[PDB]
Design a protein around this ligand. Structure first.
Ligand SMILES: [Fe+3]
Length: 154
């Protein structure tokens, strides 16, 4: 019983899941950290490593790896929702609101190993690693991301 066998089993049949559903799905992966080890990639295009490992018409699974003191952009997920589980380490998740053309910081909290973060539709966040060790997380997006939008901090 390995990671893809696990994904087809849990995610492969969801139709129109909620961020509720996705969070629960993630927590249903046994030994998720160990399972995804072969799919952890290193920073290529981004400050952070990013590997897409599953996609159907409903969702998209991504493995993310944020080095010490690195961060994502400030982004929304277009028409998609999202949920992520922390496999290893600890991220800081910061929430923003549209300051019009820009965005200002609205809220910030930590997600620890095995814990989940959620992104309701339209939500704008940045993920960062304020720690000295790396952070590996597993993201689901539904539907798959097409129209991501990056904001400049105000
Ligand atoms: Fe995101």
């Amino acid at each position: 019983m390995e990671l893809y066998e696990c994904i087809q089993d849990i995610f492969g049949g969801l139709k129109n899941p909620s961020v509720k559903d996705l969070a629960t799905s993630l927590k249903q992966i046994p030994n998720a950290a160990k399972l995804s080890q072969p799919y952890i990639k290193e920073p290529d295009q981004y400050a952070y490593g990013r590997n897409a490992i599953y996609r159907n018409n409903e969702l998209e699974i991504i493995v993310i790896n944020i080095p010490p003191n690195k961060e994502t952009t400030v982004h929304d997920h277009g028409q998609s929702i999202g949920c992520a589980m922390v496999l290893e380490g600890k991220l800081l998740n910061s929430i923003y609101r549209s300051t019009g053309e820009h965005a200002e910081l609205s809220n910030s909290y930590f997600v620890h190993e095995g814990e989940c973060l959620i992104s309701t539709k339209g939500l704008i966040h940045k993920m960062s690693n304020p720690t000295s060790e790396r952070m590996v997380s597993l993201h689901v997006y539904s539907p798959p991301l097409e129209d991501m939008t990056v904001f400049e901090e105000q």
